[PDB]
Amino acid sequence: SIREEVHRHLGTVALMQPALHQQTHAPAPTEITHTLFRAYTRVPHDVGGEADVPIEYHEKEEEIWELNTFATCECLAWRGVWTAEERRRKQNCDVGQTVYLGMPYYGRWLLTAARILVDKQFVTLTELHNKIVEMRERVASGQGLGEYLPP
């Protein structure tokens, strides 16, 4: 389809938009202005008012794991592991600028759910790392993985 290629082109050329790309490698304090200081120490979730382009908004099917992550986060709050505000602060701000916009919405929810377990010491990072290995081995051994993969 010619129109398909046309719209693909219109989106692809954005990758080539010229810019003065200044890599930052731990600059000295004398290179940080108040303007940059405020921009670097901003809370990532505060995006209201920032310029952006028009995009054809879309709906997105729910992933089984997204459903489970949501339930897990609300259950942790229900049972007093944290309040929703603590979650928002850790999930939408503490993750930092790069992860905040580079990863998926529910991906941050999930990472933060694992984070609260470790930060409040309900599990050690070692137990988390070990559990991750266990899940992978469970899949590799063909024992299945919950409702995501049958044995």
């Binding site: 470790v118 930060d119 010491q121 050690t124 990072l125 070692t126 790392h129």
Partner: peptide
């Protein structure tokens, strides 16, 4: 203790 544990206040191991 492994840094992975010490860095999170877990020094039991």
């Amino acid at each position: 203790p492994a840094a992975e544990d010490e860095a999170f206040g877990n020094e039991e191991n």
